[PDB]
Amino acid sequence: PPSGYGVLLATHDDDTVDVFTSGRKMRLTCSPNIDAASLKKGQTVRLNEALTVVEAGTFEAVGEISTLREILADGHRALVVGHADEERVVWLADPLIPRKLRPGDSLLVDTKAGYAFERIPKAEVEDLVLEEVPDVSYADIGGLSRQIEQIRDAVELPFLHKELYREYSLRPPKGVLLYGPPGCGKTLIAKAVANSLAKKMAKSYFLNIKGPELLNGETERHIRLIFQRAREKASEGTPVIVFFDEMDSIFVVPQLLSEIDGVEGLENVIVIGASNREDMIDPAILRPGRLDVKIKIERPDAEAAQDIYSKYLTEFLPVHADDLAEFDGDRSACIKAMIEKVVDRMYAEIDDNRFLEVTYANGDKEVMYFKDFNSGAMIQNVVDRAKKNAIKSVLETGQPGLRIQHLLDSIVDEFAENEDLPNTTNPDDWARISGKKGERIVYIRTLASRAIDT
Amino acid sequence: PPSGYGVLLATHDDDTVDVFTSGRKMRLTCSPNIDAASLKKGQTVRLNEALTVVEAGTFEAVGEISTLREILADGHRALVVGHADEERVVWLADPLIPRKLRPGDSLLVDTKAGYAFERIPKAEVEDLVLEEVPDVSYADIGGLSRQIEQIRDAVELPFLHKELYREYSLRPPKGVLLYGPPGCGKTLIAKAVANSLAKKMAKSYFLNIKGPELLNGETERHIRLIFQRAREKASEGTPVIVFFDEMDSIFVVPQLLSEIDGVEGLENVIVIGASNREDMIDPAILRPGRLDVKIKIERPDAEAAQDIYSKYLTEFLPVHADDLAEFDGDRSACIKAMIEKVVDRMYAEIDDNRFLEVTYANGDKEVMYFKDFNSGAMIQNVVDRAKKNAIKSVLETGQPGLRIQHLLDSIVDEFAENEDLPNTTNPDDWARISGKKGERIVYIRTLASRAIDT
Amino acid sequence: PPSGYGVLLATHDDDTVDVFTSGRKMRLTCSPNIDAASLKKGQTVRLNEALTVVEAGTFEAVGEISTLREILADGHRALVVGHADEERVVWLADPLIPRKLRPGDSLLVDTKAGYAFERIPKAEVEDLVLEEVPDVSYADIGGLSRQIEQIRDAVELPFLHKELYREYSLRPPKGVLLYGPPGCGKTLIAKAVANSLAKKMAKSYFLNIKGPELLNGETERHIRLIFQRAREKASEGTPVIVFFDEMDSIFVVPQLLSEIDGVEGLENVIVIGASNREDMIDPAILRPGRLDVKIKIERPDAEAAQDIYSKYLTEFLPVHADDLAEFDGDRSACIKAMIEKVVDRMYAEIDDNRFLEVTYANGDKEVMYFKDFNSGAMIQNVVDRAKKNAIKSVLETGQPGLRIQHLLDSIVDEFAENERIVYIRTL
Amino acid sequence: PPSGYGVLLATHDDDTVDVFTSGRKMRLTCSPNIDAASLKKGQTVRLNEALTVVEAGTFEAVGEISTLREILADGHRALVVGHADEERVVWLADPLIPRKLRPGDSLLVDTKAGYAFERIPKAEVEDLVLEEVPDVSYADIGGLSRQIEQIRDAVELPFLHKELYREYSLRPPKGVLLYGPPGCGKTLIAKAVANSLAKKMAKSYFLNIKGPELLNGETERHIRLIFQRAREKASEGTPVIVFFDEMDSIFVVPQLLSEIDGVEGLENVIVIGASNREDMIDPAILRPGRLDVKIKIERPDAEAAQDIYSKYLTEFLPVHADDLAEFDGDRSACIKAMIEKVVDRMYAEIDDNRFLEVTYANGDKEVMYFKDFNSGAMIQNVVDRAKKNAIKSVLETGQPGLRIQHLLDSIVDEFAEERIVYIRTL
Amino acid sequence: PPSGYGVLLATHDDDTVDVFTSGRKMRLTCSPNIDAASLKKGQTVRLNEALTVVEAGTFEAVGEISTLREILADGHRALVVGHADEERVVWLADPLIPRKLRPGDSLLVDTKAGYAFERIPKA
Amino acid sequence: PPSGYGVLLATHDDDTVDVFTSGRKMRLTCSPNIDAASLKKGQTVRLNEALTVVEAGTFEAVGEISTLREILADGHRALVVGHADEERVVWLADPLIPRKLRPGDSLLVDTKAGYAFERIPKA
Lengths: 454, 454, 427, 426, 123, 123
Ligand SMILES: Nc1ncnc2c1ncn2[C@@H]1O[C@H](COP(=O)(O)OP(=O)(O)O)[C@@H](O)[C@H]1O
Ligand SMILES: [Mg+2]
Ligand SMILES: [Mg+2]
Ligand SMILES: [Mg+2]
What we know:
6 copies of one chain form a homohexamer.
Chain A: E1 3-11, E2 16-21, E3 24-29, E4 43-47, E5 53-59, E6 63-71, E7 77-81, E8 87-92, E9 106-110, E10 115-119, H1 145-160, H2 162-168, E11 175-179, H3 186-199, E12 206-210, H4 220-235, E13 240-245, H5 253-262, E14 269-273, H6 283-286, E15 293-296, H7 302-312, H8 321-326, H9 331-347, E16 354-360, E17 367-369, H10 376-397, H11 404-420, H12 427-435, E18 441-446
Parallel strand pairs in A: 8-10, 11-14, 11-15, 12-13, 13-14
Antiparallel strand pairs in A: 1-2, 1-4, 2-3, 4-5, 6-7, 6-9, 7-8, 9-10, 16-17, 16-18
The structure holds adenosine-5'-diphosphate and magnesium ion (3 copies).
């Protein structure tokens, strides 16, 4: 009735079994009751006090853990390492020779028995593969009609009209790379095309990635995971977009290059780029075939000014009754007039708006203005400061609403705030302003005035 | 009788029990007096010299203890990390399978048997970095009304008018960052505004953190516990304020952005920074949604120096009757004239007050007075030193009161000991001086004379 | 009967041998059935209840594994280092004493037995060199009539007619240099010739090397891997073709020169290199055996433009319903006539088509036109932008069929995206 | 008759107890003569080949030591932590359940049977905290008047005039740090200021400490004990001085910072630091609030060196008969003349006075003299060696006194005993 | 007559002795020749298959080396530390309980029986 | 024929040899043919079921290599440091007790038997 246990290590044609038990690898004459085939390399076996097996059973469920490094060329042996970087070679259990082995996983081993019994799974859930539901639509974007229609043609049409591309044998673009001065709104349309796709379903899926998010193991882990998740979410027949913001994190590139060249195995996914620096990106990405379509986003002009302001300056916000009486209580007409006035003033070439003095290679001097270095984020800050001044005035004085003078003060103030604040210069802006004359620059200063690093 | 002791692993239909005993596994037969199902999995049991179970008792209460990492799929196995990162998989205990299992706990185990027995409770002391009564008030800072109003706009206004922002659809900024040369008042403005808003409850918190102690239970876990405490205290509905003094500890920056974006949903939490250096801060922090307003604290000018002197030389200190007779019983005007005299000598552009000579790369030179290298801490260090000189004058003469000559000597002294101290300097000083002159600096000379590195 | 196992130490002439078992070393006799000399030093053996060796077996295949630090001068012992900085002197197995012993190997060791068993080597398996199949032959190559047959003579002919070259005793040009403006089919002709050789074994090793791939130790080990792989690939005698891309980044030079000189002596190796910037090409790479044929690829003329446009404008694409009546259902005639019209539009020397004005030292403002600055990539941009405009048109009107006016508008839209010369200014 | 040994585990009502023996746990019935109540959980017991408890015994006095981490709610188990952080849960011996068990204590435990056996007192002589009455006055210190006045202002003026500082709202400093070249009277200035403040009481303490003593039981315990003793000795209101000579050895630092920040509330405490390397000190210590006042003591100049030589040579100097005639035998002026001539000689820019050479990184070579490498300790050494060599000479000749060349010989031997690219001594 | 070895731990006046051998400490009878005073505390002793101490010799001279931490108040047991930071309380040899014992010394120890032998000199 | 192995530590005038075997230390009688004076110390020797020394074998050639720290003045004791900073005193070898050894050399020792065997040359 009492009985010990052992683990099989080898078998012979003579129906004799090698068993590890009592810390010793003995050879045993198996009982004729059981067969010679159901015995498994790594199978626990009962033993009698006469030291003879009477049963072949299950596999060990508890023991030392290790990480698999290599499967030996023979195929029956695995080279693994332990807790304190102790490394050993073991054999494999029959279940190991319910998923197949992937070198780099974890195994359950008994070092004294020298046998691995089970691939033990360790899983960590990553939030990067989690999709994102975009929030802002094209009604929140202004002064980008040409570029928004370009992105419409280059992104939403292939998903909506795959069959038209098929019958015309036109390969849809695979990589779109936006570029523009910082604060123009690249991210806005980049994450609003996903809303456009979601609304254009007569199930869109977006997955955002940030450079600082993937600038920290190392970063190359998540690229394969996100690409595979996109491949899975695309093979089901649904549109999907992977978005890479701030390509400046890239120049590692070659793995991404290989993956994007393999992306041609898929036909309903586009990687969308975005950057403030065209130069700093690795040009191999920009080579046609991987990232083909380029779209420039421009600093808003005078026309785009009132258009983008109207987006922030809705009729919802309170306005002082004097302004309403100025146009007989017509909110639309009065707000249109005031936004026209403020965009004219901010785009006017008054002495306050004087920003930059250029020192060309031939010494040509021009007094530039903030109206030439404007951006969307500047408009956001301006309207925010206008609202803050208006609410302070309402609190202190009592009358509610908004007035033009608030914006007039905010616009003249905010230039000083952003003067010391960074992103006030860009090499592309210098190149664009110098293209008219064709002369380099070595001296830059503002016009309150501060120097610039050139 | 001489009886052994083992631990049960699992039962069997044949009324046979697997038991770990003598350091190895065996299979035995229980007594007919006991029921096999009555045995509990992973329970101690006694034996007889005939190797037969007679009865079983409670679970072993001592032995090894490991750290719970995860619970396996079927629930009868757990994966636990050892003392020296010695990971092993073990079975569970029947009482362990109300007070359920939670990953991250500890388990009483025996390595050889591989059977957990208990989950001991452990306690951790709270970090005690909590609210402090804000001692400094607005009336204790001089010559910063611009920054006073800026911080009040950014922090004080929102909670007083929570619904007013929703009236104008203004998203309140959360990250308010301070900076400026050392010894200017940044550490005090945060406490002052906390005191103001607390007094504005006619029921508010504050969480000071300094740079050193977060270089010293793990730093990431420390920040995590600070942030969860802040969020759960803000959940009460009252406004709360967080304050990372000396963000030069932050550049493991990554996690911090994650918690800031998490608390972005919260409506009553603020992140407030402080630093003498803007460069060493991680630029990823300086983006909208994260730290928004880059309020700059500047070395006080002549008027602000007069104010901050007036914040110390109050009319409630012993004033010498000699100068008092010059003003006929009015201590206020006497100490006022004291203040103008001392500030005039302090900011005087005389040869004594020459501090630095700035030699630029072009070769030009610029003599610098202490007025441009002043600070807010030096005013403390000179007023208190003058008071100490008054004490020693009283000791050596017996005449009480304070005289102008004390501060007159104190100014030249404070310049004397700090002649070897570049603590008044900051990279922004060189940058702004080069911008003002238009030439990059190459050499530094003070007027003893020293050449601090360029 | 039940029995254990032991590990041999060293034999003795008295029908006995030292053997380690049960955690200690004994001296045991062996059965007369076996010969002690036949037993290998370190061969695992079986025992008995009487504690006597019965027969041999196989060497233990599992245990600890250690980095062989060095081999002792005795020729049968060696010092190895364990995982925990432990250093042990151990014996050596008979198979270990023909892949010789070198420092840094990984050896199988049992600490109790103190015996090395087997040198498990690391498997440095990499795919920095791979075989890739061609995509399209010259059948889709447009406007390169005279640029393909000489390539066929250069590389395709020598393998098929080796006897003629043996009679001539003439070495085929192992390298042909390709250069010109970007987007002129430099890779396309290489792919075409690779496909043609892949259709002429009625068995083709093609290797592609990229400049970024070279930029991936330093470049020496990489390029050595590619060149040696080419060596064993050409060893079999199967025709081998190698390609190199945009060598402007290259020319280190001497190591590449030595490698290509070494591979020059090989018989059936052919390598073709192409690069855009001919001017910055080092003449040293042009030495005999290397690339000696320099073929200039230039911007297409009217007929080459016709051919290349017809290559992408196959009759399998829809044609405007209204314009079908003009050609009476002849879709091919409509397509070719419209291609003629569009090619004339690009090649029209009108104010619209002006590209660049350059003032030389002689005061001439030579007006450049897109007909002088056309390329295959530019043509592809033309055709696919026109096709996208046609898709938008049919979407907004519901009438299928590619219309010429869409191509005409594409022509104007597409051109806003891309004596010694002294002044340059685009028009 | 031979008998083994085991460890008791628990007790049972049926004349049976569990025993750990030979590495395994068993259940055994004790001999009837012994009583179960007598046996204590964890008491070593005597076994036999019959496997029966025959009589009780002592408790184990060997094994491993593990630091207690927590005491469980069961009142019989304490989660202990091993040598290399191998925590275990063990029973507690009855003598451990008078003195009480506390977190952080050291216990004697056996990993084999998991039973704690006793606590271990980890103590020391604790004589480092023994305050020393100062024995050096300001008169023994010379050439440091600039430092004398300011250290006087820093230290005793707040103590003697706490109220006077009070009506001026001036918060007195807490930390005073001293720094300079080695052997510059730092310990002397500390002892002297202690003596001065001791005289100005009409029960102070000078807890003089040395650095390398702290590296030796654990440093944290010493730095805590000294400061609790300072707190209890300052609770009376008498002035207390806490002095850490050679502070450079430290940089634990965070414990010291937290402790001084906590204890600054007490108004009659002053900390004094001395070191040879300002840079090697952790910056947080020098932050205002902790170390308010900083003082530099530099190498003496010619006047200060003359003062020091006057300190070591009073009017009681035995002089040679040769020197008696020239100065009319007036020692009060003869010693002054000798000091003047020696300070003129040693400070002279002789090639024999070269000590170090400096090669600036901009191609400039400059040589340093003896004067920039003169310290009070070096003056002490040269004066003492001149005196002993004068004694040797007058014993080997017969005519007693002191001669000028003796110290000139003493000068050379003791002295013999932009960026910079290369340095050399000469 | 084969014979093993053991190490003394404590003595008893009942003609019996406490000796650690074969990885276990046990009480054994004593041969008539030896005496409690004759046997030396913490000394190697010859054993027998009959499990009885017969001959006590000189102290064994090789083993581990542990740097002494401190000497506990009782004076019979001292705290020493090991190479891997382990610390153990061990009994002292009679020569260690003349050249005095001070903290900071290296002692020859046999941690199996927790007995220190002598203060090894260092160069 | 089935015979064991042991290592010879010390000799006795009583014509009995100290030997370590089976994870312990015992002293045993030798075969009458061999003589203790002829029996040089240190050589591993063959045993029997009767636990009697039968023949004097050769030296050890496989063990643990460790850098010597110091040779003690008495000459038969050597302090040596192992892999994990462990420091222990061991005996010496017949060749070691004529080639010249230096501190810091690599000596082949076996920890339990505490006997050094030979200095392995370095590269
Ligand atoms: N004869 C041709 N027929 C079709 N397409 C061509 C032809 N010549 C050039 N092209 C186009 O120009 C591009 C040439 O690419 P490649 O051969 O790699 O040279 P490059 O690197 O200079 O662009 C291809 O994308 C192809 O579409
Ligand atoms: Mg953006
Ligand atoms: Mg501050
Ligand atoms: Mg090409």
